[PDB]
Design a protein around this ligand. Structure first.
Ligand SMILES: *C/C=C(C)/C=C/C=C(C)/C=C/C1=C(C)CCCC1(C)C
Ligand SMILES: *C/C=C(C)/C=C/C=C(C)/C=C/C1=C(C)CCCC1(C)C
Ligand SMILES: *C/C=C(C)/C=C/C=C(C)/C=C/C1=C(C)CCCC1(C)C
Lengths: 223, 223, 223
């Protein structure tokens, strides 16, 4: 039906397999700290799996009028990210034993990032969609700022090493989302929805399963 | 108007009385641990009370097209369960001093269970509704698994005793929900909505007020 | 377009400036406890900023049929309060080192207060709107009760002093909301929407930025 269906189907399959792999791999783990990381990390692709399935079956898709056309908007992505992005930030924060204040700042700014992105995606006045994109981007920039300038002296080498790798992976991949949104169907519409869907699938799988494989294979998750 | 109104009214009344009873019973409690259990346990029927009232007044009801008919779907149940089921799991987890990793696993899987159940309840393609039911059921099975195989050596007798009772009550009652959903109006439609509503009221009151009476009368909630 | 636009624009500007001020003021803070208070306190007007902008642009506004008319209902307020009121209660609770049980009681009752207020705001049967208002008010009264009768012996003077001031500010300002709602467009409609919007803007800015200035200038936030 929809040309982007193949990418949604592949996304569903990859998130599903990733979830199952992490689920199996986490069996037997008794270390409290490691359990936290496995729980957070397995839940991420499990949620993504449900939302990709939602998009594939057509439930997480809605039509938004703007620019004089009926624009297909997959709102299920925000329902996904609303829960998965904060969880991913939690993995990074727990890894460096961040204090509660910083965790709340990250989670709250993340909520603002996704919430304003959702508002922008459903906004009927074309020009306003970009106002929301700008605010969401400012929130993302705040998050990236905190990750880099927001624990070193008393920090295990493996912890510092894995955190630096996951932080770099996060900054690169997350930074692409606003660009894809801006040039894709939710924004300027210069890149067709099918290609946009492919881009998000690669980014999502990398930021979730890729990110997860790196974290769960590290000894940093253990006390 | 709607034949199932009597069960919604009785459900509203029972949840309301249960809330008031727990509220009174919890007065004077100074023990920190006991306070946690009273807060969690009183909030559960208070939320259920609001959603049952929502259904009674008709606000938590919507019409979903599928199978060639306008099907009355009480979505308010998921708004209820989304918050009450995780809270109930929290009572069980705190009772056994479960570690954060396991708590997150339970809460996250519970969210998936209710979220996919909601998607299934509102899905317009009949066959797909059952795909969502299957995923939600898999999440429930994971939860039941964790409760039984997911703390013994260093565990007070009263704690182990009450937990085992509440765990058995939980497995039996919770396991009935997917069956009721499957044979009821949201699924195969072989059992009429009025009878389905009665079933859920008995299950809800038992899983909330019944469950609550057992827990709050035990000495396990005290340090 | 809408006469109340000026108050929404001023609200947007004030919440935005307040957010920026708190953001700057919180720079350099290394004290863990102080960080918690700055995070919570800065997030509050940041969220309010987004919802006021939502109302200004028209996204957070919907039409609800009741009383034989199309009533303009700004639902964005509840999306705001759902997150900001619990955060404000968290500031007060952390300030007095409240135990988890009491925190959950406050947060849960707050959720009920806002959730039932939202249901009332969107209810099509006029008389029922007031039933929801009554339940929401009962939840607010419970919260006010807990704040006054729910830690003294072992409590720093500055902490007790600032808490008492913020508690008084909270009881006075919060108590006004149900009155405004009752006499405003969501209720009896005796006070026009434009005036109602002005009232909420003054209350919101005072309960958020005013409240925030008092808290963040106190030494109580430091360990
Ligand atoms: C599993 C998914 C991940 C890690 C998704 C990350 C999403 C973002 C960083 C999204 C950010 C956006 C903006 C900064 C601007 C507005 C549009 C968004 C929501 C695509
Ligand atoms: C107070 C209510 C309780 C304890 C409700 C429990 C609800 C469930 C365990 C629901 C589970 C469902 C499935 C496993 C399959 C799909 C349909 C549901 C949501 C009814
Ligand atoms: C930043 C906003 C604040 C501090 C808002 C406070 C909101 C309330 C205390 C609202 C309470 C209401 C009731 C008690 C009755 C029903 C209507 C409401 C939601 C306006």
């Amino acid at each position: 039906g929809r040309p982007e269906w193949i990418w949604l189907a592949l996304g569903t399959a990859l998130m599903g397999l990733g979830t199952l792999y992490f689920l199996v791999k986490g069996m037997g783990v008794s270390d409290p700290d490691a359990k936290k990381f496995y729980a957070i990390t397995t839940l991420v692709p499990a949620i993504a799996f449900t939302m990709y399935l939602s998009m594939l079956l057509g439930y997480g898709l809605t039509m938004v009028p703007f620019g004089g056309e009926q624009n297909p908007i997959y709102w299920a992505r925000y329902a996904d990210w609303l829960f998965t992005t904060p969880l991913l930030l939690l993995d990074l924060a727990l890894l460096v034993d961040a204090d509660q204040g910083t965790i709340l700042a990250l989670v709250g700014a993340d909520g603002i990032m996704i919430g304003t992105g959702l508002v922008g995606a459903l906004t009927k006045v074309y020009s306003y969609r970009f106002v929301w994109w700008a605010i969401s981007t400012a929130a993302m920039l705040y998050i990236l700022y905190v990750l880099f300038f927001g624990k070193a002296e008393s920090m295990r080498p493996e912890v510092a090493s894995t955190f630096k790798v996951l932080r770099n992976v996060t900054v690169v991949l997350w930074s692409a989302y606003p660009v894809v949104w801006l040039i894709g169907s939710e924004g300027a519409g210069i890149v067709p929805l099918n290609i946009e869907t492919l881009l998000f699938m690669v980014l999502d799988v990398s930021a979730k399963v890729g990110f997860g494989l790196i974290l769960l294979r590290s000894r940093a998750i253990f006390g």
